[PDB]
Design an enzyme around this catalytic site. Structure first.
Site, short mmCIF file in Angstrom:
data_model
loop_
_atom_site.label_atom_id
_atom_site.label_comp_id
_atom_site.label_asym_id
_atom_site.label_seq_id
_atom_site.Cartn_x
_atom_site.Cartn_y
_atom_site.Cartn_z
N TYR B 509 9.64 -18.63 -5.90
CA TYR B 509 9.10 -19.01 -4.61
C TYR B 509 10.01 -18.28 -3.63
O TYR B 509 9.56 -17.47 -2.81
CB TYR B 509 9.17 -20.51 -4.37
CG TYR B 509 8.55 -20.84 -3.04
CD1 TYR B 509 9.34 -21.13 -1.93
CD2 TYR B 509 7.18 -20.76 -2.86
CE1 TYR B 509 8.78 -21.32 -0.68
CE2 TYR B 509 6.61 -20.94 -1.62
CZ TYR B 509 7.40 -21.22 -0.53
OH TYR B 509 6.81 -21.37 0.71
N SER B 592 1.93 -18.37 -3.12
CA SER B 592 2.22 -18.23 -1.69
C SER B 592 3.40 -17.28 -1.47
O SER B 592 3.30 -16.08 -1.75
CB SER B 592 2.51 -19.62 -1.12
OG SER B 592 2.55 -19.65 0.30
N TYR B 593 4.52 -17.81 -0.98
CA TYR B 593 5.70 -16.99 -0.74
C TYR B 593 6.15 -16.44 -2.10
O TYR B 593 6.76 -15.37 -2.20
CB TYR B 593 6.83 -17.83 -0.10
CG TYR B 593 7.86 -17.00 0.63
CD1 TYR B 593 8.81 -16.25 -0.06
CD2 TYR B 593 7.84 -16.91 2.02
CE1 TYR B 593 9.70 -15.43 0.61
CE2 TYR B 593 8.73 -16.09 2.70
CZ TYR B 593 9.66 -15.35 1.99
OH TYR B 593 10.52 -14.52 2.67
N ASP B 670 -9.10 -19.62 1.65
CA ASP B 670 -7.74 -19.93 2.08
C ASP B 670 -7.66 -19.75 3.60
O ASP B 670 -7.99 -18.70 4.12
CB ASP B 670 -6.73 -19.01 1.39
CG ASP B 670 -5.32 -19.58 1.41
OD1 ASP B 670 -4.97 -20.28 2.39
OD2 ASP B 670 -4.56 -19.31 0.45
N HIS B 702 -5.83 -22.48 -0.04
CA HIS B 702 -4.46 -22.23 -0.47
C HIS B 702 -4.03 -23.00 -1.70
O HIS B 702 -3.10 -22.60 -2.39
CB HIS B 702 -3.49 -22.52 0.67
CG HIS B 702 -2.16 -21.84 0.50
ND1 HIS B 702 -2.05 -20.48 0.34
CD2 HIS B 702 -0.91 -22.35 0.41
CE1 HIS B 702 -0.78 -20.17 0.15
NE2 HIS B 702 -0.06 -21.28 0.19
C1 LIG Z 1 3.21 -20.72 0.70
N1 LIG Z 1 3.55 -21.83 0.07
C2 LIG Z 1 3.17 -20.30 2.19
C3 LIG Z 1 4.43 -19.47 2.26
C4 LIG Z 1 4.37 -19.00 3.69
C5 LIG Z 1 4.19 -20.37 4.33
N2 LIG Z 1 3.27 -21.08 3.45
C6 LIG Z 1 2.82 -22.39 3.59
O1 LIG Z 1 2.06 -22.96 2.81
C7 LIG Z 1 3.34 -23.22 4.78
N3 LIG Z 1 3.04 -22.67 6.09
C8 LIG Z 1 4.83 -23.66 4.59
C9 LIG Z 1 5.47 -24.84 5.36
C10 LIG Z 1 6.77 -25.15 4.91
C11 LIG Z 1 7.48 -26.18 5.53
C12 LIG Z 1 6.91 -26.92 6.60
C13 LIG Z 1 7.72 -27.87 7.26
C14 LIG Z 1 7.44 -28.25 8.61
C15 LIG Z 1 8.28 -29.11 9.34
C16 LIG Z 1 9.43 -29.62 8.73
C17 LIG Z 1 9.74 -29.29 7.39
C18 LIG Z 1 8.90 -28.41 6.65
C19 LIG Z 1 5.57 -26.63 6.99
C20 LIG Z 1 4.84 -25.59 6.36
#
Ligand SMILES: *[C@H](N)[C@@H]1CCCN1C(=O)[C@H](N)Cc1ccc(-c2ccccc2)cc1
Ligand SMILES: *[C@H](N)[C@@H]1CCCN1C(=O)[C@@H](N)Cc1ccc(-c2ccccc2)cc1
Ligand SMILES: CC(=O)N[C@@H]1[C@@H](O)[C@H](O)[C@@H](CO)O[C@H]1O
Ligand SMILES: CC(=O)N[C@@H]1[C@@H](O)[C@H](O)[C@@H](CO)O[C@H]1O
Ligand SMILES: CC(=O)N[C@@H]1[C@@H](O)[C@H](O)[C@@H](CO)O[C@H]1O
Ligand SMILES: CC(=O)N[C@@H]1[C@@H](O)[C@H](O)[C@@H](CO)O[C@H]1O
Ligand SMILES: CC(=O)N[C@@H]1[C@@H](O)[C@H](O)[C@@H](CO)O[C@H]1O
Ligand SMILES: CC(=O)N[C@@H]1[C@@H](O)[C@H](O)[C@@H](CO)O[C@H]1O
Ligand SMILES: CC(=O)N[C@@H]1[C@@H](O)[C@H](O)[C@@H](CO)O[C@H]1O
Ligand SMILES: CC(=O)N[C@@H]1[C@@H](O)[C@H](O)[C@@H](CO)O[C@H]1O
Ligand SMILES: CC(=O)N[C@@H]1[C@@H](O)[C@H](O)[C@@H](CO)O[C@H]1O
Ligand SMILES: CC(=O)N[C@@H]1[C@@H](O)[C@H](O)[C@@H](CO)O[C@H]1O
Ligand SMILES: CC(=O)N[C@@H]1[C@@H](O)[C@H](O)[C@@H](CO)O[C@H]1O
Ligand SMILES: CC(=O)N[C@@H]1[C@@H](O)[C@H](O)[C@@H](CO)O[C@H]1O
Ligand SMILES: CC(=O)N[C@@H]1[C@@H](O)[C@H](O)[C@@H](CO)O[C@H]1O
Lengths: 726, 728
Positions: B509, B592-593, B670, B702
């Site tokens: 990840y 994802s990441y 997604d 997603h």
């Molecule tokens: C894959 N898992 C992708 C990777 C790029 C970002 N992705 C997402 O799903 C989300 N946008 C990730 C994310 C992570 C953490 C938070 C968060 C918000 C506020 C406090 C703590 C954590 C939100 C979204």
């Protein structure tokens, strides 16, 4: 050595052609390198009609020219920007061939959707921003002919999506009269036509995917409407807005949804038009004459002709086109016999009944030329082979006299031909596609004597004799009395003892022929020659060129017989003793992808694997014109029941027993990606594994250089792996 | 013969883990569903009683997927017609049921298609959002109150977040905050009028003739971001015919100077509310403590009380600025802030005074504040045994920082090193939830003497079941790189013989502040791969990972697609270095990441990996949402960080895939990671002439989490993996 995938992809073995354009009845133009020489059909000598240099500097890549009939200009087309299957826009420029000075004034617009000269002289008619403009002189201002155009709404002079692709098989929607005096065109209204929408990602640089929206009518949906007009291109002034006279009806067509399906000028004052009812088993032709004083156009009902059907649709894909006598008083046109075989029939404009001038268990592919004593046509009579092609001439004064112009020229390498006559069928170019290598000859109509050989493709023959080329067997099998043809591409040094893996190549669409005498150098070539794999094809029920009994066998029932007979073919091919029962795959594109899906979802255990490219999955997802024509309307009062009965996803469950590969371009304006997505979704719901591959921004053709190469590489691996080949 | 943890076991979830989800409705009782009917529990004695009976809402004509009790226990919010939107946002229908009269209310019904609804911290008031508008119902049977009249689909949001605030800043669809009292209802207002829309097809069911195009206000890196305003209304001064007056809290002037975001809202008292704002360049943030004023009914925020929180090494907070936990009188609050040495600890603030006092320090970080009493401060940290991937509940005495006590470290050491906690209204009691490294254990406790009341669940049923199945073991360790230690975990097969050479799959990840190495007990795909396919599944936390201080986490600041990728290939290198790894069968996969990194690693041409699977990954950051991407990459403009933005695309590394097997996967629906992302990857590969395996999932988002999609995608990756490792 052998013919490999690289050869196919890198086009290492090119077939020479001889593309010529008659400019008169004694002369013709032919591109000799970077030169456009002009030849003399008789003595066959030539001369540089235009030197490559002429059009030298000009920071623009020029693709395909177009010399006016007068030969006083050569509109140059550049900036070609591919759209649908025939449509596309480009920038233009005229060039006086005697003032060697490129036009500068009033120059044709940019982003032109279509242009064209008058049949004679140098009149130019072009479409821009969906409107019609007319030019009487290359350097003089253009005259607006229409003021209703509106991007993907109102189309004047150009067909809408479905009309270009399934009706006029062209973008152009205007017909010039014999001497350029009248300019005819159709008008399409897409306003109430729904839009199919898909994303287009474009270049990595694009931050947000783009959304393409096309007025595209799907089965039973609101169709585009149409109007026909005729404008006299001589009454146009710098003041008056050329008054266009419309040609409506027939009332038998106005009663409801219909289409314009053909435009054929008979004389300089007589034009023919054929109409088709949404339910495509009824067609009406109208012959209208210009009424000197009155300016309007009249179509005597005494002169209209009805072409209907009771066992299918009308025509092979549309009501055939008429070929009028010189005095426009009568004509000939392919129509179906009382026996079901399409033949040439002779009509008298105001005489309801025609006389078949040909007959027999074979059919006329088309009418090529018409003189005062002969009617030139192509058919598949010879040797009783629906998949062969030949030029024939029939005496108008005695139908009992019919001579075959090509049949015997070289029965060895030529069993499939095509023709190209001069400005008055004084000379014609014979074009042999095979079974051997392309052969182009020049002949004289008065004697039909062979003037000479324009191209024998000797250069290829040479190279090809050092390659373990595959062989080709074109024969037939019998089913319930009737016999159905098929062809097998056999590996080099074929051995009827050794068992070979078999890959069924299929399309199987209404009026199709995957079995012919044409010479092709393609992916099947490599598979057979390098992977020692037999690639076969079979034209069963629903196929064309064998009478309606076959072609209409699937009327209102797509996905039944064509599918069944497909399974039977392989089912028997195996029973031929040289096929590896355990290694039989099936593959196809478009309709061929559909049948390939329906079959791998039939559960006959016959196939191990299969590949479906850009397949249809549910007829309701395909365009009206093409679909309804075989299925009718998806209403419970009509055929909605079968529509729903032929979906690929209905047979998801049965996929568990086979190895499936689904591929589809994401920008397919034709067979929408939605089709293949609806399929995968079905397999996911049932729990069926299979491989997939989508091609970003590629259309139905998945033809881009890299895209085309990639898909064939992928499919290879799929096949070679499915057959356990090193 | 003895079986293994098959794919069907994970897919068909044959070996289930018993949970114990409470729902404190007070500081003395909690709700628990008897998997047929929810009941009430007494924390003190443990005795329970059937609160709501299954045989109650029958013949309802519809199904309930979630009940919701009111603060005075006088009403029960019923929820049906649930329809998911994004990760948190959804819509549904509601009905109020009097528990005091066992009668469903039939007057002034809550609208159909309601976006959000919450009670009041006290009593039984209601605030719900319908059609982007806020409404209030003092009494269930009574009519509502139109708090807003500006609502409009995709444009103006009142009380609910828009796609980006939901997913990136707040992680919730809700955007309204009741005052602990109930008299105040503060809410945010978002404006997307100019936020570009991401469009994509949704095919829907087979019967859909023409595909539907989903349009969503989604800001990509550097795009036009949504705006936002704050408001606080008085739910007491409602009762009228006249329109509700909504006071607005603007600024700070340090935020209005440019683009910015509202990132946190936490009430302090009945007349005090704290708001935290973040700048577009998320490295600066202001905390505004605003006090109510009865004189003018307005809210003021004396700049003399703002608390600035900036970072010159990165962004602020792990994913956003931490929340404040205020004291009784509300003049002081505790909060997490990384200390001068880089670690995140608890800092004491007195509003009027400058700077703050750390009541915690060390080479470990405080994960989060769980409860604040006038007595102590309870929190979770990774202090214990210096294991960054461990989690325990502590409590520090507020009057003497040296009296720190671990409440979970010794409870059951060999079995529990990762804990999460849940307290009652005033934390008189709490439930610890041990999710690792042994079998998930649940315990209830009393704060006073921290006594161990009892066990709520010790999965002794699963335990028995796992005594006739060859389970794999988990190895949590580390390695030193550049004089620093980075941890990694491996799912080792049964009888893991260090003599043999095992095929290894690197689960990755590696996203900012991520952690794939921990003591958590899991039963997933890896369980199956190690148990049945005898594949060693490993994960590694490298530079940019979290919970080990800013020196590491900020390592990838303004440099996404660099070290985290590198440290990945390296880890692999270091693993085949241990001897029980087959250099010929090393794979890598990520979602994802994880797909991004898995793609960039397969595109670095290190040749260390044979094959790799990438599920819905990012291909180039200009394609992702601003809030997230920007917090790491900054602005994609020549004047900021554009160049690197262009250097970290998977696309540019296409040619290097020629030496690898790649399986690309993405849901076509997604909304997070636009399918467009993989559409570009596949295209660049095709242009460089690289063959690869792809798989799209019609209408999946997603998560590719439907029942059929989830099983289908995993079956598939299992086929690709095995194929890659030449094994049956
Ligand atoms: C894959 N898992 C992708 C990777 C790029 C970002 N992705 C997402 O799903 C989300 N946008 C990730 C994310 C992570 C953490 C938070 C968060 C918000 C506020 C406090 C703590 C954590 C939100 C979204
Ligand atoms: C596959 N090739 C798919 C299967 C459904 C039909 N398919 C098409 O792509 C049709 N549109 C192919 C087609 C297009 C145009 C004609 C035609 C024939 C005669 C005159 C004009 C146009 C035939 C078939
Ligand atoms: C134009 C040219 O290339 N064709 C010539 C023609 O002009 C000439 O009259 C004839 C003489 O034999 O031969 C041919
Ligand atoms: C006198 C008047 O009717 N002028 C016409 C008007 O109908 C219209 O604007 C048309 C298109 O531009 O051209 C002009
Ligand atoms: C003049 C032009 O043809 N506009 C027409 C007309 O307004 C009508 O709406 C028709 C069918 O919808 O299509 C459009
Ligand atoms: C479909 C609609 O948008 N087009 C209208 C059409 O209904 C109407 O017939 C015409 C006037 O006759 O004006 C235009
Ligand atoms: C709208 C149409 O019917 N009329 C067009 C319009 O451009 C103009 O009104 C006219 C005279 O200038 O030329 C023509
Ligand atoms: C039944 C249960 O759900 N809670 C009960 C509660 O009502 C009572 O106050 C107490 C007395 O022994 O025991 C507890
Ligand atoms: C309810 C409201 O704030 N509507 C706003 C505002 O009028 C402005 O036109 C716009 C700019 O983004 O934001 C929208
Ligand atoms: C893009 C947006 O809708 N522009 C509006 C503008 O037209 C209006 O004058 C202003 C008043 O608040 O709000 C802004
Ligand atoms: C004196 C006392 O009763 N003051 C509060 C007042 O600050 C608050 O504005 C009001 C709202 O309903 O509740 C009351
Ligand atoms: C009670 C009253 O009618 N409420 C009004 C509403 O009608 C109006 O449209 C809105 C916008 O200014 O302001 C409020
Ligand atoms: C039950 C409680 O004491 N209500 C009061 C309320 O009147 C108002 O004063 C507000 C601010 O202090 O909240 C408190
Ligand atoms: C106020 C401040 O701490 N903001 C910093 C700024 O100094 C720097 O411009 C930016 C990019 O490197 O990171 C952020
Ligand atoms: C605005 C930003 O992207 N660039 C500046 C950079 O020139 C400077 O060294 C640093 C100083 O704090 O702040 C950053």
């Amino acid at each position: 050595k052998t013919y490999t995938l690289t050869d196919y992809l890198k086009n290492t073995y090119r077939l020479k052609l001889y593309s010529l354009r008659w400019i008169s009845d004694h002369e013709y133009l032919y591109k000799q390198e970077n030169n456009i020489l002009v030849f003399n059909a008789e003595y066959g000598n030539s001369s540089v009609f235009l030197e490559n240099s002429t059009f030298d500097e000009f920071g623009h890549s020029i693709n395909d020219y177009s010399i006016s009939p007068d030969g006083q200009f050569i509109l140059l087309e550049y900036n070609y920007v591919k759209q649908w299957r025939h449509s596309y826009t480009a920038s233009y420029d005229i060039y006086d061939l005697n003032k060697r000075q490129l036009i500068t004034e009033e120059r044709i617009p940019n982003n032109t959707q279509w242009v064209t000269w008058s049949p004679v002289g140098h009149k130019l008619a072009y479409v821009w921003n969906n409107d019609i403009y007319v030019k009487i002189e290359p350097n003089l201002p253009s005259y607006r002919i229409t003021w209703t155009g509106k991007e993907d709404i109102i189309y004047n002079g150009i067909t809408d999506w479905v009309y270009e692709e399934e009706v006029f098989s062209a973008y152009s929607a205007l017909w010039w009269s014999p001497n350029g005096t009248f300019l005819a065109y159709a008008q399409f209204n897409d306003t109430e036509v729904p839009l199919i929408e898909y994303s287009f990602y474009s270049d990595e640089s694009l931050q947000y995917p783009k959304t393409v929206r096309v007025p595209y009518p799907k089965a039973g949906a609101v169709n585009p409407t149409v109007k026909f007009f005729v404008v006299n291109t001589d009454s146009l002034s710098s003041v008056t807005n050329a008054t266009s006279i419309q040609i409506t009806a027939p009332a038998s067509m106005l009663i409801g949804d219909h289409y314009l399906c053909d435009v054929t000028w008979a004389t300089q004052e007589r034009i023919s038009l054929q109409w088709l009812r949404r339910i495509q088993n009824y067609s009406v032709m109208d012959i209208c004459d210009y009424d000197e004083s009155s300016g309007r156009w009249n179509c005597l009902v005494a002169r209209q002709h009805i072409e209907m059907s009771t066992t299918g649709w009308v025509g092979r894909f549309r009501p055939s086109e008429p070929h009028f006598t010189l005095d426009g008083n009568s004509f000939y046109k392919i129509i179906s016999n009382e026996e079901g075989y399409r033949h040439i029939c002779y009509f008298q404009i105001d005489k309801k009944d025609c006389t078949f001038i040909t007959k027999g268990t074979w059919e006329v592919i088309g009418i090529e030329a018409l003189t005062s004593d002969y009617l030139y046509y192509i058919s598949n009579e010879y040797k009783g082979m629906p998949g062969g092609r030949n030029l024939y001439k029939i005496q108008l004064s005695d139908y009992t006299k019919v001579t075959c112009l090509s049949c015997e020229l070289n029965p060895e390498r030529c069993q499939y031909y095509s023709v190209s006559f001069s400005k008055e069928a004084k000379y014609y170019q014979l074009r042999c596609s095979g079974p051997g290598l392309p052969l182009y000859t020049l002949h004289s109509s008065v004697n039909d004597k062979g003037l000479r050989v324009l191209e024998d493709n000797s250069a290829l023959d040479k190279m090809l004799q050092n390659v373990q080329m595959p062989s080709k067997k074109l024969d037939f099998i019998i089913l319930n009395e009737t016999k159905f043809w098929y062809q097998m591409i056999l590996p080099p040094h074929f051995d009827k003892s050794k068992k070979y893996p078999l890959l069924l190549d299929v399309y199987a669409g209404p009026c199709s022929q995957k079995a012919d005498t044409v010479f092709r150098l393609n992916w099947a070539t490599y598979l057979a020659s390098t992977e020692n794999i037999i690639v076969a094809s079979f034209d069963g029920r629903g196929s064309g060129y064998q009478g309606d009994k076959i072609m209409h066998a699937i009327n209102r029932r797509l996905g039944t017989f064509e599918v069944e007979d497909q399974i039977e073919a392989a089912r028997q091919f195996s029973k031929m003793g040289f096929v590896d029962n355990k290694r039989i795959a099936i593959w196809g594109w478009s309709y061929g992808g559909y049948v390939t899906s329906m079959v791998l979802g039939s559960g006959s255990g016959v196939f191990k694997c299969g590949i479906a490219v850009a397949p249809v999955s549910r007829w309701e997802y395909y365009d009206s014109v093409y679909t309804e024509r075989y299925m009718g309307l998806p209403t419970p009062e009509d055929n909605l029941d079968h529509y729903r009965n032929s979906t690929v996803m209905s047979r998801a469950e049965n996929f568990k027993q086979v190895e499936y590969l689904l591929i589809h371009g994401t920008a397919d304006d034709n067979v929408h990606f939605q089709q293949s997505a609806q399929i995968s979704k079905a397999l996911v719901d049932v729990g069926v594994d299979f491989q997939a591959m989508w091609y970003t921004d590629e259309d139905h053709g998945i033809a881009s250089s890299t895209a085309h190469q990639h898909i064939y590489t992928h499919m290879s691996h799929f096949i070679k792996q499915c057959f356990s080949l090193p």
